[model samples]
Target: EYPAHWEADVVLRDGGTARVRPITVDDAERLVSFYEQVSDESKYYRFFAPYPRLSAKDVHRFTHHDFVDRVGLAATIGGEFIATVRYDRIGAGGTPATAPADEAEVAFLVQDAHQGRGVASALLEHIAAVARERGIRRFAAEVLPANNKMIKVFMDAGYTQKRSFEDGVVRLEFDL
Candidate 1:
């Protein structure tokens, strides 16, 4: 488990502050509420499917994780979830004997109302820093070609970014 001290306060581009911390099992309801606040287009962009609601299993998968192989973080303003970010170790908990094991699949979601206010970017930056401190050397994500915002987030990050189109999706990777 990540230490509780992993929590921190971040100032958004809108001049507002939000608290960021590793997500806990107790955040399931907040996750559901956060999803409800997202727009259909944002949902499709994030999930690649028209998910009407998060099922129990989906909530479980998102909230419960082993900090070493999977970590999730939530950003909240005044205790309301505004965004979340996560990364799962790629390939057997990063234990491949024949290949370097310093990569992870990363993803993020921000409430529609907060989309342009730098919430996602702030969460991404913080998550990337945490991932790197945990020994992750690279972050990878598969984004929809139409999700320009997400693509720009990865590209704008100060990392060596590589992008490719495959199977109707855009694959992005950045060396941390």
Candidate 2:
């Protein structure tokens, strides 16, 4: 049986299989592999940089960070890495931070080949479930305004977003 916080054998759309489990430093290589599978445009949209090259420091920061106060979920299918999301509780007194930790800042990326295949949807749902357990009742994300795919992903999942034109980004907030 899989341990708590670990959902194994996740069934995907189109007869594929996937799983959501805790990440480890050992998975650094897989993170790199997944980045390689992402399209340059997709990477640009997700990161807000026209270039999608993930540096070594980025790989370390994403995969090796300590998430004890938060939940970092990784999705893998058919032995190939696909998508991931992180849910964290920010602010003092465990209260959700309106600006910082109270908001569940979700950042996700699915391999180009897996787009529209429900990988990101599953990760979001998983994060919501776990965030609720951690007393998180709100979610927020900052994405490039041009990244319609990500904007739609959050809105379709029940989030209301506001655009920050001065910053050239969209800020979305979800009240759970």
Candidate 3:
């Protein structure tokens, strides 16, 4: 289900605007270019390693999502991607208790040029709205504790339930 209606234009923290929309299979090529421009340290921060490049298969997998259990959204300026965010159902594949209705794991990546512009935070707000509309009432995010900007985005997103260190990652949880 391609949710065209979720698209919106947002003002960044710097007062400029960008469009936010759901990612689709057609974004494969742009995704590559988008990642190519991100700084190396940022790549490591988001992916936990020096992922030199995005494999064709990686691009394919990232762009293709079911839009419910797996959904990805992008923020763009001048029709170019500046940031992206995705959320996947946490207790998935029939884990009875928390399947579908409860929590989803969320992640985000912002281009170096757009860092600190509030792109990811706008994404956080919109994607969380999307999640709740899809019947997911909670969200979970795991960030390297050192990525203080990302941690603050999560905390400042206004739904802080609790944050705890889990296996060296700052695991954050909150109700939608």
Candidate 4:
């Protein structure tokens, strides 16, 4: 399908380094462990509810995605999964003639222990570069109004953003 050879070593704001790479089928267990390390509030913010666990099917969906229409990336330090970011193409079948997809729905989660260490920021930067290379013109997300951290991440990335409030959720869009 699409390019999946992307990988890099990201240096965090605190001078620590983490490896970022495409998610793999073998990462199911690591993804589950990362979910367990997330706080209840973070889970709520990420999933919009108190999702305490990921079932087998959920894990499979997260780990197994086609690189063209759906892509996922994971970050790890010391071989332990600390965060994951993903984007799903919107509209009919993710097929665009002559040009790349113009938009994708983006989302990410960082372990509670790794929050504020520039994990999400690094993931966003890397993913946006990948997205732009793939011809994606914009990224969009639905976030809770109170999720200031996520809002700040989008704002600080230096992209032109359009934000809207609807049904108590903030819909955000950033041009790539």
Q: Which candidate wins on TM-score?
A: 1
Give candidate 3's whole-model lDDT: 0.82
Where model 4 places Cα greater than 4 Å from the true spot, the runs are 1-5, 92-101, 159-165
For candidate 1, write residues 1-176 as lDDT tens digits. 68776799998887989999988899898999889998888888889999879889999999998777788999998898989999887765434321246788889988888877888788888888888777888888878878887878877775434555356688778778
lDDT of 4: 0.82
The local distance difference test score of each candidate is 0.82, 0.73, 0.82, 0.82
- What is the lDDT for 45 in model 2? 75
Model 1 clash tally, residue pairs: 0
Q: What is the lDDT of residue 158 in candidate 1?
A: 55
lDDT of 2: 0.73
- lDDT, candidate 1, residue 93? 43
Between candidates 1 and 2, which one is better according to lDDT? 1
Candidate 2 residues lying further than 4 Å off, grouped into runs, are 1-3, 88-101, 163-166
Q: Between candidates 2 and 4, which one is better according to TM-score? A: 4
Tens-digit per-residue lDDT, 26-53, candidate 2: 8888888888888888888777776566
In the order shown, what is each candidate's alpha-carbon RMSD? 2.7, 3.8, 2.5, 2.8
Q: How many residue pairs clash in each candidate?
A: 0, 3, 0, 0
Model 3 residue runs over 4 Å out of place are 92-101, 159-165
